[PDB]
Amino acid sequence: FACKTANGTAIPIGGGSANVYVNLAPVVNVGQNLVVDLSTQIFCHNDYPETITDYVTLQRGSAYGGVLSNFSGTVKYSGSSYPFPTTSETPRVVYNSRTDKPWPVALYLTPVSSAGGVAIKAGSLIAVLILRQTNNYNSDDFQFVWNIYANNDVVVPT
Numbered sequence: 729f730a731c732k733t734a735n736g737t738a739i740p741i742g743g744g745s746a747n748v749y750v751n752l753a754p755v756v757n758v759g760q761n762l763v764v765d766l767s768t769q770i771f772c773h774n775d776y777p778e779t780i781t782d783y784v785t786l787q788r789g790s791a792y793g794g795v796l797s798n799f800s801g802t803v804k805y806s807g808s809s810y811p812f813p814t815t816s817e818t819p820r821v822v823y824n825s826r827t828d829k830p831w832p833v834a835l836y837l838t839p840v841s842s843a844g845g846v847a848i849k850a851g852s853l854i855a856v857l858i859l860r861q862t863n864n865y866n867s868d869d870f871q872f873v874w875n876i877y878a879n880n881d882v883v884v885p886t
């Protein structure tokens with residue numbers, strides 16, 4: 729089991745950490761959601777699906793910078809939503825193919841009532857998402873740590 733990113737970096741067997749750079753909607757209104765879709769950013773596969781089934785969770789999602797200060801919301805993992813920043817580990821998604829498969833995570837972030845002007849700064853860290861991988865074969869339990877950076881400013885109109 730290993731993963732790769734839309735920025736051309738990787739995390740091999742055994743886990744590790746990578747950076748992800750996301751283009752964000754430039755304007756988000758109070759009462760609306762900023763969508764941060766990681767399924768177009770992070771892709772993983774199973775290295776021996778003939779005999780092994782891989783299990784993958786979002787172990788913890790943490791907010792930083794302008795997301796931490798100016799937004800609330802949810803994380804959608806494989807069709808179900810949970811609070812973000814996270815308060816538990818999600819259920820598992822099965823990886824059962826060598827073919828790249830997106831990691832089905834997206835953040836839905838809404839501005840807090842006090843937000844206005846530049847709410848997320850270009851280049852800044854917005855989230856850290858920990859992917860936990862196990863299997864039905866051995867006792868491997870690996871963390872793939874994804875540091876999510878904004879590529880651009882996000883403005884919340886007054």
Ligand SMILES: O=[N+]([O-])c1ccc2c(ccn2-c2ccc(O[C@H]3O[C@H](CO)[C@@H](O)[C@H](O)[C@@H]3O)cc2)c1
Nearest residue numbers: 729730741742773774775776779780782862863868
């Ligand atoms: O039954 N056999 O004959 C048999 C069984 C296993 C075999 C082979 C040949 C290679 N392997 C093998 C390949 C990869 C492997 O672990 C990595 O990939 C797993 C699947 O993605 C993942 O769960 C692990 O955490 C680790 O990332 C573990 C074993 C033959």
